[model samples]
Target: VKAIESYDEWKTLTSGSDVVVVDYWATWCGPCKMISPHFAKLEGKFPNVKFAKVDVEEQEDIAKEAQIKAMPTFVAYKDGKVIETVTGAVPAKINALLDKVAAHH
Candidate 1:
């Protein structure tokens, strides 16, 4: 997985992509830590899909812009539009989300 440090880079990366998975997390969040390995596994599993992460505490403006209300919020984007949102840390739930995104393609 890649770390998206800036909003500009985040926006640019999402635009015109087949699919982009953004995992929003924070250093102190327990749930986020629990799900990190899952996300990494998924990233390795889905090599074609762009996997990126943002630290909520570090990127306050980006988190606010993305409207992330919880730690480990997973958002999938397609053609620069938000396609799916998974709040909290639920790695098992990602399979269904990937299916939903696959349908769009």
Candidate 2:
């Protein structure tokens, strides 16, 4: 998975990809750390979708723009627009959401 360092980078990535999944997280959040491996695994599992991560502490502007209220917020974008958002570290729900989003492409 790619680590989005800035909003500009995020725009460039999402604009070009058909399906983009971004995990908004922070270093201090334990749940974020716990689920990160699963998120990375999903990247390999879903090659058709673009997988990325944004650190809330490092990318405050992007997190605010995305209205992230919690750590490990999963945002899915399709065709440059947000199509789905899932919060928390639940693997099943995240996988289901990713599968649903991929099906649209």
Candidate 3:
């Protein structure tokens, strides 16, 4: 997963894509660390969707606009708009959202 460095990069990643999912989190977050590996795995699994990562502590500006409220915040965007938000380290919920968006689009 590529790290979203700024809002401009975020806009570019979200736009012109059927589905873009971003994982927003922090280094100190336990759940975020736990879910990191699976997030990368899903990135490989989902070929159509653009997968990205954002460190809440490093990318504060992106985090504020991304609506990040918890560790391992999984935000799915469809054509640049937020479609789903799953906060936690549950791969099942994350996979559900990925499948939901990937299938819907």
Candidate 4:
């Protein structure tokens, strides 16, 4: 898992990798905190996919470009494009999303 520090870093990850998973969150968002462990666990499981995290508080530009409307938004990218987004702190949904995206690899 990687913490996205800049817009260019995010762009590189999505464009350079075959599969990218982004967790859009904020420092104060409780649900984001709750799902962090789950997100981290997925890293080792999906070796073909890149797991990246964005802090809306720190990288507001990236959040804005991604069109973040809510905290704990999980965006799955395939071939540099957003293919699926799970907006919420639901463990089941995130797993489903991972499964769906990882299957492509």
Which number leads on TM-score?
4
Query: What is candidate 1's lDDT per residue for 1-105, written digit by digit as tens?
Result: 889999888888778658888889887787887778888887777777788899988887788889887767899998888888998876668767766665565
On the 0 to 100 scale, the lDDT of residue 10 in model 1 is 83
Instruction: Assess every candidate by TM-score.
Output: 0.88, 0.92, 0.90, 0.93
lDDT of candidate 2 at residue 101, scale 0 to 100: 77
lDDT of each: 0.81, 0.86, 0.83, 0.87
| Candidate 4 accuracy as lDDT | 0.87
By descending TM-score, how would the candidates be arranged?
Answer: 4, 2, 3, 1
Segments of candidate 3 deviating more than 4 angstroms: none
Question: Candidate 3's error at 13, in angstroms?
Answer: 1.4
- What TM-score quantifies how close candidate 3 is to the native fold? 0.90
Q: State the TM-score for model 2.
A: 0.92
- Poorest 10 consecutive residues of model 3 by lDDT? 60-69
Model 2 lDDT tens row, 34-89: 88899888888889888999988898778778888767799998767888899889
CA RMSD of all predictions: 1.5, 1.2, 1.3, 1.1
lDDT string, candidate 3, 1-105, tens digits: 978888888888877557888888887888877778898898888887888888888876787777677777888887778878998888899989888877876
Residue pairs with backbone overlap in model 3: none
lDDT score at residue 37, model 2, on the 0-100 scale: 92
Highest-lDDT candidate:
4
